[PDB]
Tab-separated table of C-alpha atoms in Angstrom:
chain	number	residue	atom	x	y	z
A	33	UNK	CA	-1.356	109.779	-10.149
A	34	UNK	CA	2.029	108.820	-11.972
A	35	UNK	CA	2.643	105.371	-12.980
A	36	UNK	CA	6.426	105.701	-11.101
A	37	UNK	CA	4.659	107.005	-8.133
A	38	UNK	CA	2.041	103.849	-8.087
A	39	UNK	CA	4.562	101.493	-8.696
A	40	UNK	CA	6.948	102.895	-6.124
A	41	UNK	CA	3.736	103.043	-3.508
A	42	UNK	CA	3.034	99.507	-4.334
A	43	UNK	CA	6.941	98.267	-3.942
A	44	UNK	CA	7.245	100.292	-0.716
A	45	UNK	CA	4.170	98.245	0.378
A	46	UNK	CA	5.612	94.620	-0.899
A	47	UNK	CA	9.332	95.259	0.671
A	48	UNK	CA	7.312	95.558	3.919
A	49	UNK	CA	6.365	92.110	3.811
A	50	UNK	CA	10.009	90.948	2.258
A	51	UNK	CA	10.975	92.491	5.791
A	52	UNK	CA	13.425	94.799	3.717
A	53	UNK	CA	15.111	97.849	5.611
A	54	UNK	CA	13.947	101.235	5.149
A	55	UNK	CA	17.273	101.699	3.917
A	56	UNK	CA	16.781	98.713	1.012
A	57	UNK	CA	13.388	100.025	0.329
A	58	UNK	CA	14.738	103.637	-0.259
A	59	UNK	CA	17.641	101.782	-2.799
A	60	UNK	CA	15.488	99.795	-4.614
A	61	UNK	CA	12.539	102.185	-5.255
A	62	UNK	CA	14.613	104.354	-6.705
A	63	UNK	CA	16.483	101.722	-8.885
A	64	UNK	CA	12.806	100.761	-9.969
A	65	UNK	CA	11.914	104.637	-11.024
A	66	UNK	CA	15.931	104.714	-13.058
A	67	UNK	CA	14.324	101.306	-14.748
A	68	UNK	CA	10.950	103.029	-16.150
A	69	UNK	CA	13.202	106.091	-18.092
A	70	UNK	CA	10.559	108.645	-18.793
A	71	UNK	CA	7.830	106.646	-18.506
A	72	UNK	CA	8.178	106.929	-14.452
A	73	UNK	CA	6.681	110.482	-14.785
A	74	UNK	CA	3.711	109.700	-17.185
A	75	UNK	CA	0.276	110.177	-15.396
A	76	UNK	CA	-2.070	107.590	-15.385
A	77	UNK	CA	-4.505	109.410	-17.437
A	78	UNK	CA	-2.555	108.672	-20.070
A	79	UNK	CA	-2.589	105.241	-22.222
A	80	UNK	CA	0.168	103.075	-20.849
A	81	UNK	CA	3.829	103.558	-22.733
A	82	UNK	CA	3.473	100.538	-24.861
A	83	UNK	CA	1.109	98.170	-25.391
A	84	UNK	CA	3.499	95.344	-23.635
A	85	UNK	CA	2.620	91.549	-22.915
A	86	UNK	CA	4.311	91.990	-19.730
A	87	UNK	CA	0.970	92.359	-17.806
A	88	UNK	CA	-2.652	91.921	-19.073
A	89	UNK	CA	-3.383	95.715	-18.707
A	90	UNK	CA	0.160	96.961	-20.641
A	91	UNK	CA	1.562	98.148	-17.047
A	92	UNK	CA	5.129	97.537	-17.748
A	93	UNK	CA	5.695	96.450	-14.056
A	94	UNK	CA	5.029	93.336	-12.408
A	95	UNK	CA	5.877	91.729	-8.999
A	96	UNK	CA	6.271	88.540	-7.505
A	97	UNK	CA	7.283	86.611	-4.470
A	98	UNK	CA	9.175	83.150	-3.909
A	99	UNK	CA	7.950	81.252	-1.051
A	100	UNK	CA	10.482	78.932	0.918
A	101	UNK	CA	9.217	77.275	4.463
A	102	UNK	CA	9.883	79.386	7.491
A	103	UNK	CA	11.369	82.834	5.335
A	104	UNK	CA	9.790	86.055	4.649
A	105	UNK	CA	8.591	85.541	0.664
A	106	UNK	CA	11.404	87.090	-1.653
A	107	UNK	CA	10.608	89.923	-3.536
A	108	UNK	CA	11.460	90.557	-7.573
A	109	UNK	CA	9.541	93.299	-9.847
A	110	UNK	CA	9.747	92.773	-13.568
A	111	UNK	CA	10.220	95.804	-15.950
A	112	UNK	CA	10.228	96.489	-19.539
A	113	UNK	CA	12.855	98.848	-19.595
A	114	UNK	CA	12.568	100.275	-22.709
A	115	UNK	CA	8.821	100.880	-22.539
A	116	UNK	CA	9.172	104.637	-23.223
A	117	UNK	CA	9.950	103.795	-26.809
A	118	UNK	CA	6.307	102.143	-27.236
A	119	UNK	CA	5.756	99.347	-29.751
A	120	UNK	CA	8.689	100.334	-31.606
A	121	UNK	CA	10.291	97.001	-30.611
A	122	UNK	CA	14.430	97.981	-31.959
A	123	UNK	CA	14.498	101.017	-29.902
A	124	UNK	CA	12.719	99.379	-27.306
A	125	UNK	CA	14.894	96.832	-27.151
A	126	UNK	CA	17.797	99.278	-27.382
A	127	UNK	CA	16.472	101.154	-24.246
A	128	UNK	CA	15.862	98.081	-22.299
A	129	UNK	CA	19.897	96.544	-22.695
A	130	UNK	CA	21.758	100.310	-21.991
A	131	UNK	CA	19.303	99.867	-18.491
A	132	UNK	CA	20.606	96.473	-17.931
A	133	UNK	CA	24.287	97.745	-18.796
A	134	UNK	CA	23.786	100.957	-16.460
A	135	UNK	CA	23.314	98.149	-13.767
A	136	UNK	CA	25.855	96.121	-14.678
A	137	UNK	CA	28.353	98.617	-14.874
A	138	UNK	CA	26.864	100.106	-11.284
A	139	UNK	CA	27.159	96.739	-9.488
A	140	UNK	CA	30.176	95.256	-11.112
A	141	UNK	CA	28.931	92.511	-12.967
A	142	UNK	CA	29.364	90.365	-16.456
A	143	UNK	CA	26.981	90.704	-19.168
A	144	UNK	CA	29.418	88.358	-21.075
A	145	UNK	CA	26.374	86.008	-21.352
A	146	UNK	CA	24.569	88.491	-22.769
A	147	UNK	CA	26.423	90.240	-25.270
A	148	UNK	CA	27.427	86.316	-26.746
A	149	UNK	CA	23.740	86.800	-27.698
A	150	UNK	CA	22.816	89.902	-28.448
A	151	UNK	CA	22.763	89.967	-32.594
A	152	UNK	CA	20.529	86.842	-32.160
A	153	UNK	CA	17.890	88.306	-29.874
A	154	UNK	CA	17.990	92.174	-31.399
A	155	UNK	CA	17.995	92.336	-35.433
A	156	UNK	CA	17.402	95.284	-37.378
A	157	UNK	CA	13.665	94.774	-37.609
A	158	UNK	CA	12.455	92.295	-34.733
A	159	UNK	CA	9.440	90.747	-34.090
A	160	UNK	CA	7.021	90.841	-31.527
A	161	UNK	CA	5.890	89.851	-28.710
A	162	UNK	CA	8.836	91.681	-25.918
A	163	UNK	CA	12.317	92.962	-27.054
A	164	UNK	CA	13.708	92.799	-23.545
A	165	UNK	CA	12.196	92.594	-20.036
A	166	UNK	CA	14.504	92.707	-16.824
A	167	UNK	CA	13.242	91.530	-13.532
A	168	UNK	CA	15.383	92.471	-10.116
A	169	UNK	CA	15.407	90.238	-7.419
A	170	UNK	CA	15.738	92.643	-4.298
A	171	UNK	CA	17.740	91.465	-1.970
A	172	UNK	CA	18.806	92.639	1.755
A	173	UNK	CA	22.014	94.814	0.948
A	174	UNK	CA	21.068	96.582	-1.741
A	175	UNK	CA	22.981	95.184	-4.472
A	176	UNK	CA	19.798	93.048	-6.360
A	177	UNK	CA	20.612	90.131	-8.375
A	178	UNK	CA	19.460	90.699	-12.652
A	179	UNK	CA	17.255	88.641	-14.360
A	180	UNK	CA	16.986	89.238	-18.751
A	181	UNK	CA	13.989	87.888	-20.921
A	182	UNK	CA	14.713	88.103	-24.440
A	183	UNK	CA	12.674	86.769	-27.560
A	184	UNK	CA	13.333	83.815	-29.028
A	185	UNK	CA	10.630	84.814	-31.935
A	186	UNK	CA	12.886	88.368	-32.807
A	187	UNK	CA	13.918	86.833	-35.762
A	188	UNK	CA	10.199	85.333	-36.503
A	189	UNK	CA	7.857	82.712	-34.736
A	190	UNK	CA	9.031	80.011	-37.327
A	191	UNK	CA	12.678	80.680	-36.561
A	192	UNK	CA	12.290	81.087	-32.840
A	193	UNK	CA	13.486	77.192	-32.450
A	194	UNK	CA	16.441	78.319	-34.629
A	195	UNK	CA	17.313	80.729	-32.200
A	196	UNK	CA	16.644	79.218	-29.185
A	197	UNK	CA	19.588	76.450	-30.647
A	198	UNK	CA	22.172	78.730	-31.487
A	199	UNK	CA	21.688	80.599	-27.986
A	200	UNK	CA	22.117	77.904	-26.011
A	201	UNK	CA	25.454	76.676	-28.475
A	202	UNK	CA	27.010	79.789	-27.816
A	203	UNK	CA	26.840	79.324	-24.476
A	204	UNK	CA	28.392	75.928	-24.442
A	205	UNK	CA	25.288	74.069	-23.441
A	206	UNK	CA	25.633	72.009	-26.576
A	207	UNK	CA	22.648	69.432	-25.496
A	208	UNK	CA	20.308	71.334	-24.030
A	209	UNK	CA	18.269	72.025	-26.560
A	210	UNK	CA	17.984	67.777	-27.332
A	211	UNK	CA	17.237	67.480	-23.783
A	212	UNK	CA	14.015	70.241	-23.614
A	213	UNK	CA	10.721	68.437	-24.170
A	214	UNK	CA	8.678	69.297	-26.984
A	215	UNK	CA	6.440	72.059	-26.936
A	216	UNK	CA	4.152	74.030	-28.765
A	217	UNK	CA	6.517	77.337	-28.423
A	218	UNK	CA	9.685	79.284	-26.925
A	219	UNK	CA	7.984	82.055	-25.123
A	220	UNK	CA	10.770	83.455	-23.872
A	221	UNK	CA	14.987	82.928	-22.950
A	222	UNK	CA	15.998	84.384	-19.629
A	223	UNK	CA	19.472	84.683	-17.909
A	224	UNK	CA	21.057	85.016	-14.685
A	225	UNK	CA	23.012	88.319	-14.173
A	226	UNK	CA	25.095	89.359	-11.122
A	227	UNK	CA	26.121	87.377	-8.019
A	228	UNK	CA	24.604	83.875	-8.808
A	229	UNK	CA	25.957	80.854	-7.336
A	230	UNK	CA	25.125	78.656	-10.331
A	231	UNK	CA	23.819	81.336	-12.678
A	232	UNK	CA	20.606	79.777	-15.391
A	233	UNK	CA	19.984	80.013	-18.589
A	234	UNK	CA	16.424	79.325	-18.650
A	235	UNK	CA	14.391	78.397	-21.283
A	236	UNK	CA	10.169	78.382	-21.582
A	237	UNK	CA	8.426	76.597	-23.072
A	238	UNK	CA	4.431	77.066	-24.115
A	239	UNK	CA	2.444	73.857	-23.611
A	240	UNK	CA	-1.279	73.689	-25.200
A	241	UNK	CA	-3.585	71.586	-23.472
A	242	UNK	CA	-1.491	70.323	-20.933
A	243	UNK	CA	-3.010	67.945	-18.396
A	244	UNK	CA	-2.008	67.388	-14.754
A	245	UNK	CA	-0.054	64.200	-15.436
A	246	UNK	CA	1.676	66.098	-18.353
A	247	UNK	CA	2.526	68.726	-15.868
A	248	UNK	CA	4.611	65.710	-13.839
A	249	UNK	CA	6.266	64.051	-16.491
A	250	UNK	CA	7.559	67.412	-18.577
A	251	UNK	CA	10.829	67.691	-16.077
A	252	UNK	CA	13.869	66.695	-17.702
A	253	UNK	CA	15.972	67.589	-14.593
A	254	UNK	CA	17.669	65.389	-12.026
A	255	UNK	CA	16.732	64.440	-9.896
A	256	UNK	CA	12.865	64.315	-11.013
A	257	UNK	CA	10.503	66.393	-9.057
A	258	UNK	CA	7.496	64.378	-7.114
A	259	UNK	CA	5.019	63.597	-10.037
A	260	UNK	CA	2.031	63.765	-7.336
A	261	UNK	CA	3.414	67.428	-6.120
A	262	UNK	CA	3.567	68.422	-9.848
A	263	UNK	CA	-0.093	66.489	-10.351
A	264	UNK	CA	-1.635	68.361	-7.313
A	265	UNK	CA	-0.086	71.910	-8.177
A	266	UNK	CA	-1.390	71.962	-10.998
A	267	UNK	CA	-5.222	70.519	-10.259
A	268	UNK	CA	-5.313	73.228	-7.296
A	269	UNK	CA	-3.904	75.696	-9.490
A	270	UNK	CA	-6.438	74.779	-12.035
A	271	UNK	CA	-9.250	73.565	-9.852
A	272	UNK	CA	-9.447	70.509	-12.648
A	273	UNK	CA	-10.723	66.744	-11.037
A	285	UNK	CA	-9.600	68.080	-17.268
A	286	UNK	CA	-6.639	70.485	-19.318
A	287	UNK	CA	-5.603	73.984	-19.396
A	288	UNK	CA	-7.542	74.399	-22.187
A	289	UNK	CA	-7.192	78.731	-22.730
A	290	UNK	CA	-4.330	80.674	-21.419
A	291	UNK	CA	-1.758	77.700	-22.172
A	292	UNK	CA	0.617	76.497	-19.089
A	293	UNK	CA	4.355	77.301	-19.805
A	294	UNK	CA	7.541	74.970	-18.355
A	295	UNK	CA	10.889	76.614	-17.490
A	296	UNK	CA	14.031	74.856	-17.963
A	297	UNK	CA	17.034	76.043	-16.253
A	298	UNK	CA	20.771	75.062	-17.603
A	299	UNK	CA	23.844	75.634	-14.788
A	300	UNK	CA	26.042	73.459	-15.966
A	301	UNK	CA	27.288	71.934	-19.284
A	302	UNK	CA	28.224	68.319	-17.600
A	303	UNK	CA	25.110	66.554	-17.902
A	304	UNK	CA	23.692	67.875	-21.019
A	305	UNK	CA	20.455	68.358	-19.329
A	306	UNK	CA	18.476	70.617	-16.835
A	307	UNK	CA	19.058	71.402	-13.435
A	308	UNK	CA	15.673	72.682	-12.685
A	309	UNK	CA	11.748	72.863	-13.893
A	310	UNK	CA	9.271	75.345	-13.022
A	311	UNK	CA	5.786	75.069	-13.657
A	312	UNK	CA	3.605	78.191	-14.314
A	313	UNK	CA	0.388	78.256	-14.714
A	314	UNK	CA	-1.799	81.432	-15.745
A	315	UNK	CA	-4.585	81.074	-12.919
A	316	UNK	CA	-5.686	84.693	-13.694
A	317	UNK	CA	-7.532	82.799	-16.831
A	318	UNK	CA	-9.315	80.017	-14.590
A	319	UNK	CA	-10.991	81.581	-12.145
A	320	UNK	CA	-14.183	83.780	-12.032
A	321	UNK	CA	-12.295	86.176	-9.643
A	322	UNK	CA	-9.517	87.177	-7.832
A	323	UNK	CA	-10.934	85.572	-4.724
A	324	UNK	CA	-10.700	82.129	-6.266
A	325	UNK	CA	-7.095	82.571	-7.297
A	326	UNK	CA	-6.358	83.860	-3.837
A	327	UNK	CA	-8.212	80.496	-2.371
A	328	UNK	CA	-5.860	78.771	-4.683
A	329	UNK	CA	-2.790	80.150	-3.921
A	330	UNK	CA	-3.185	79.658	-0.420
A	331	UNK	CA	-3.713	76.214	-0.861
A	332	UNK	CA	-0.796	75.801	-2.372
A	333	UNK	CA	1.179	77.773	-0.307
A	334	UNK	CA	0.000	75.379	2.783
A	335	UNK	CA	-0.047	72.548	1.120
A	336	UNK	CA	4.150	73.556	0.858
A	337	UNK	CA	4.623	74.791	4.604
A	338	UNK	CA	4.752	78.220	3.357
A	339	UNK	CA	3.343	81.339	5.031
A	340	UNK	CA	-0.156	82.296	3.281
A	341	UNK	CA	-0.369	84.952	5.683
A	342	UNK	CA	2.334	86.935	3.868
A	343	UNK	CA	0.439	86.422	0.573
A	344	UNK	CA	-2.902	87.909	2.204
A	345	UNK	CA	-0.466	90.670	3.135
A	346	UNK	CA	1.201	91.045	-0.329
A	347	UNK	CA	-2.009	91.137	-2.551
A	348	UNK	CA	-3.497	94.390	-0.452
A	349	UNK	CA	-0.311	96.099	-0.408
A	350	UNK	CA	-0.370	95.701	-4.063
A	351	UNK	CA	-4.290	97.342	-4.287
A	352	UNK	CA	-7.086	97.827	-1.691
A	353	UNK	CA	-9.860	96.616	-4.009
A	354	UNK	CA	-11.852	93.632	-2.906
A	355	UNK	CA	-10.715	90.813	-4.450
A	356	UNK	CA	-13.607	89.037	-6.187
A	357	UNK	CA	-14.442	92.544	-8.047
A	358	UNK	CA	-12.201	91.664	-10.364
A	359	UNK	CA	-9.181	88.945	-12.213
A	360	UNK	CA	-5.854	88.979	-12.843
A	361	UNK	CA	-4.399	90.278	-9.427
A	362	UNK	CA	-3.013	87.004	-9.340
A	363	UNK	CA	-1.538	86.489	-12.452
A	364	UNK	CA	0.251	83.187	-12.211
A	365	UNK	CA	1.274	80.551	-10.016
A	366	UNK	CA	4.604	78.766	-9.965
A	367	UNK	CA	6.312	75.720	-8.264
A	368	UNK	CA	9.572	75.591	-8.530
A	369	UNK	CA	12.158	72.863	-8.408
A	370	UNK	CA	15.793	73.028	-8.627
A	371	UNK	CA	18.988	70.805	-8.040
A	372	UNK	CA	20.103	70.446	-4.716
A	373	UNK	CA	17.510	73.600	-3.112
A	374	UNK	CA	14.105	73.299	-1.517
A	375	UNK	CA	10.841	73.563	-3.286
A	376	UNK	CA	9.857	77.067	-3.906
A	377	UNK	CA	5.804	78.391	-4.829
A	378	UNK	CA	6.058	81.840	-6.833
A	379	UNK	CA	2.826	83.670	-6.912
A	380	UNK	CA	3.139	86.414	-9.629
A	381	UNK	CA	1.122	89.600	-8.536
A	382	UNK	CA	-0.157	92.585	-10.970
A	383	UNK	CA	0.208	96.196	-10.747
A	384	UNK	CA	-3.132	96.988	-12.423
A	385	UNK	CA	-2.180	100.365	-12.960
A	386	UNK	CA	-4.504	100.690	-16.126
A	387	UNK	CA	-7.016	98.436	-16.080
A	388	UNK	CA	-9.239	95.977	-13.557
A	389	UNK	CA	-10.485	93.377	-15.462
A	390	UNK	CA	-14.295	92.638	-14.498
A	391	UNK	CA	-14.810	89.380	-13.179
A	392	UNK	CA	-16.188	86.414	-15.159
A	393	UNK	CA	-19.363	84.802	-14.351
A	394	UNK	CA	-18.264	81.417	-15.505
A	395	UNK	CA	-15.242	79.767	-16.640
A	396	UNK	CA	-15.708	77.717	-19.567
């Protein structure tokens, strides 16, 4: 009946399929209930904290798993730590980095990254949409690796460019920006935190009408991923023959190194959840995908009703979005990103236009 004590239900559920110890489980519950502040004992009666874009319904929790051939799926949960400030977006964004530097300080690692950046993503008065979102990759041992989102839009939407720039100067990835393709937004700017071997600074991007051979010729990295993969991802994802033409497709470009000048990797994500009548045609989808990769689809079955028991096609947005993921040098990963839907079910359409 609490929001913590859904969320932690739902994570003990998912860590099952990860194949995580009791032991893990135990950890990394708790670490998710230290995340929420306050808002981990707020009943479910009650509107959600703040009316966040982090999930459709304002649940400030998300989860997803990474699919590699022949593994149990990796499990992250995203969290807006700061959500029991509301919409007040400075002391939400205030809440959400002493949470990040609590872990940080726990687990011995560098927020140098982030502190370079700090004035830049949290001015006096920001801007909507997200102050700061952290997402934990929960990994056997205990010790999770740290993922940040910040907004490149705190300082305005027509200055998020701006920002996105200087970010990625102070970091000495002096080309980067050059070497994105152009877009119709900067959604977000995410980094690596903790043990990394080649830690990211990612940047998304928001693409409007993107088609499926857009989809394969938006990677900048090298080497280039498959255009067909890319071409067929995205048609299954979208069931198209055709362009995403509501809930706009993002690309994520991830910087390791300063050598090159341009990416080492390219994700595609698209927002299925606005495609699809139903939750049963996003599962179909996913699936798909997940065979068409030699990945287990069996897990997802398992993850999706150990996130909720309701039938599938009585509602959308379980499945938020879908994900293929490419990156220097490491195999090709599907990320199916999976809702809490702690406040709301949305109905299912009838048609999509």
């Amino acid at each position: 009946a609490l929001l913590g004590d859904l969320a932690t239900g739902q994570l003990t559920r998912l860590c099952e399929v990860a194949g995580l110890t009791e032991a893990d489980t135990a950890a990394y519950t708790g670490v998710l209930i230290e995340s929420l502040g306050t808002s981990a004992g707020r009943p479910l009666s009650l509107p959600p904290p703040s009316r966040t874009f982090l999930s459709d319904d304002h649940t400030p929790v998300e989860f997803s798993l990474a699919f590699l051939p022949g593994r149990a799926p990796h499990l992250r949960v995203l969290v807006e730590p700061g959500c029991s400030s509301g919409d007040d977006l400075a002391e939400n964004g205030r809440a959400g980095l002493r949470a990040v530097h609590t872990m940080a300080d726990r687990w011995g690692f560098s927020t140098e990254q982030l502190d370079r950046l700090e004035d830049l993503f949290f001015p006096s008065s920001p801007e909507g949409p997200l102050a700061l979102w952290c997402a934990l990759e929960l990994r056997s041992g205990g010790v999770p690796g740290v993922k940040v989102y910040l907004n490149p839009a705190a300082n305005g939407a027509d200055r998020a460019a701006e920002t996105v720039r200087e970010a990625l100067a102070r970091l000495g990835h002096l080309q980067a920006f050059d070497a994105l393709p152009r877009a119709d937004g900067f959604p977000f700017l995410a980094l690596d935190l903790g043990d990394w071997d080649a830690p990211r600074v990612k940047i998304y991007l928001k693409h409007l009408g993107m088609s499926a051979a857009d989809a394969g010729s938006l990677p900048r990295m090298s080497p280039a991923p498959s255009r067909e993969q890319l071409e067929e991802f995205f048609r299954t994802a979208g069931d198209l023959p055709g362009r995403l033409a509501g809930r706009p497709a993002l690309t994520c470009h991830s910087f390791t190194e300063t050598a090159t000048g341009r990416p080492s990797g390219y994700t595609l994500h698209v927002p299925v959840r606005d495609y699809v009548r139903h939750d049963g045609e996003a599962r179909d989808r996913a699936v798909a995908v997940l065979r068409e990769h030699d990945m287990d689809s069996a897990a997802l079955d398992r993850a999706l009703a150990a996130v909720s028991p309701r039938p599938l096609s009585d509602g959308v947005g379980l499945i938020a979005y879908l994900a293929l993921v490419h990156q220097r040098g490491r195999p090709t990963r599907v990320t199916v990103y999976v809702s809490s839907e702690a406040y709301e079910v949305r109905p299912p359409r009838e048609t999509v236009p």
